């Protein structure tokens, strides 16, 4: 029924590479068989297993690189958050919350008060 990503995540990158090689060999033999046998659908399962193995390999490699770049500024661009271009160009929360000393003093001295009418 194909490979499972949660089973592949328990394996090392060497085991994943060897499983990918075996899956490629199996797919090659299956497409050789497809020339004679009509309507052979196992090649779809083998293709999806290859895709899953490659996905898990890429996941492990990218997690290792994320750990290598943890905490430090200038992460790789494909590892940075993909918001929109305008959102990534927008001022951070620290900026546009920056205020001058005069403005901070006056907004501390005279904040918007809470007041109710009672008549």
């Amino acid at each position: 029924a194909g490979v499972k990503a949660y089973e592949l995540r328990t394996k090392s990158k060497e085991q994943l590479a060897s499983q990918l090689v075996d899956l490629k060999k199996e797919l090659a033999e299956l497409k050789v068989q497809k020339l004679s046998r009509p309507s052979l659908p196992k090649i779809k399962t083998v293709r999806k297993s290859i895709a899953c193995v490659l996905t898990v390999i890429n996941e492990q490699q990218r997690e290792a690189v994320r750990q290598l770049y943890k905490g430090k500024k200038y992460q790789p661009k494909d590892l940075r958050a993909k918001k929109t271009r305008a959102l990534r160009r927008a001022l951070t929360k620290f900026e546009a919350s920056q205020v001058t000393e005069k403005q901070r003093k006056k907004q501390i001295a005279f904040p918007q008060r809470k007041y109710a009418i009672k008549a």
Partner: protein
């Protein structure tokens, strides 16, 4: 095209006027939206009457100087005579207008009087106290109506 005895008409429709025709189908929708916005603004701000206290003011243009109406904001002189600073009045919901000047003692006295009434009829919540809910009234203008002398 000058036919029988009719008044001379001046219908200015020789431009592409059909490209700019605003039919206010959204009159009722915009009224509902304005009422909704007023409700959310009242809920968002603390108990507070949805508008600032406005001064009494004489209209220019003798066609209208016989009547009195709400102005933009109290003058600095009126605020000082009422015992407040402009910044504090702006933070306790009094509109302040640095442009207007006082040359009429009647209007100045009326504005100082309504400022004092507003101060005696509002409760300013402490910054770091308890201040139990004070039953927000929505209209300072309705609470302090403008009276024609």
């Amino acid at each position: 095209a000058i036919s029988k005895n009719l008044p001379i008409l001046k219908n200015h429709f020789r431009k592409h006027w059909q490209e700019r025709v605003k039919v206010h189908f959204d009159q009722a929708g915009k009224k509902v939206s304005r009422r909704n916005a007023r409700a959310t603004r009242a809920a968002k701000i603390a108990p507070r009457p949805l508008d600032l206290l406005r001064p009494v003011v004489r209209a220019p243009t003798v066609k209208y100087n016989r009547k009195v109406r709400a102005g933009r904001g109290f003058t600095l002189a009126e605020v000082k005579a009422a015992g407040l600073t402009a910044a504090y009045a702006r933070t306790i919901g009094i509109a302040v207008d640095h442009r207007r000047q006082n040359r009429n003692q009647e209007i100045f006295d009326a504005n100082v009087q309504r400022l004092k009434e507003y101060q005696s009829k509002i409760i300013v919540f402490p910054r770091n106290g308890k201040a139990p809910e004070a039953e927000q009234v929505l209209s300072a203008a309705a609470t302090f109506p403008i009276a024609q002398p």
